[PDB]
């Protein structure tokens, strides 16, 4: 199970936050601060996985952006390390040469992409082909 997906930058500004279990605001907040305190301090000599509370966090930096997926401990690391990646690849196709800004000024459609590829804590679509085909069929929508 995926517990949450974060996208926050080198300073910890969250720029996407899909949660997959019930949390309060006060919780969601502390959580976002913690995911920062942990991911931001790791220097690539380290590995892409960390014990995080009772779960773990897969994550890869892309420019100033940390893409974090929190998962159950028994979850397949490489699986979720590439999910993150092909999700980014879809974003870069939807937005063409995507960057932090697209994800801010367009935050509201970031979520429709995310939920196309992940829903209810599980992976949904993997096929960049179909997920793009759909994102482009919407958008033609009134």
């Amino acid at each position: 199970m995926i517990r949450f997906i974060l996208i926050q930058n080198r300073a910890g500004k969250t720029r996407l936050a899909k949660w997959y279990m019930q949390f309060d605001d006060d919780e969601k907040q502390k959580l976002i601060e913690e995911v920062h305190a942990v991911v931001t301090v790791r220097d690539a000599k380290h590995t892409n996985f960390v014990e995080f509370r009772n779960f773990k966090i897969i994550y890869r930096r892309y420019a100033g952006l940390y893409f974090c997926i929190c998962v159950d401990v028994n979850d397949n690391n490489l699986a979720y390390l590439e999910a993150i990646h092909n999700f980014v690849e879809v974003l870069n196709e939807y937005f063409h040469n995507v960057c932090e800004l697209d994800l801010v000024f367009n935050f509201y459609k970031v979520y429709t992409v995310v939920d196309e590829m992940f829903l209810a804590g599980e992976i949904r679509e993997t096929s960049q082909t179909k997920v793009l085909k759909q994102l482009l069929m919407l958008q033609s929508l009134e």
């Binding site: 930058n9 080198r10 300073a11 892309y62 420019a63 100033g64 952006l65 980014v88 690849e89 974003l91 870069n92 040469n97 995507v98 960057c99 932090e100 800004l101 801010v104």
Partner: peptide, 9 residues
């Protein structure tokens, strides 16, 4: 910190 850098390429 210049948030316009591409995430890929």
């Amino acid at each position: 910190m210049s948030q316009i850098k591409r995430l890929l390429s």
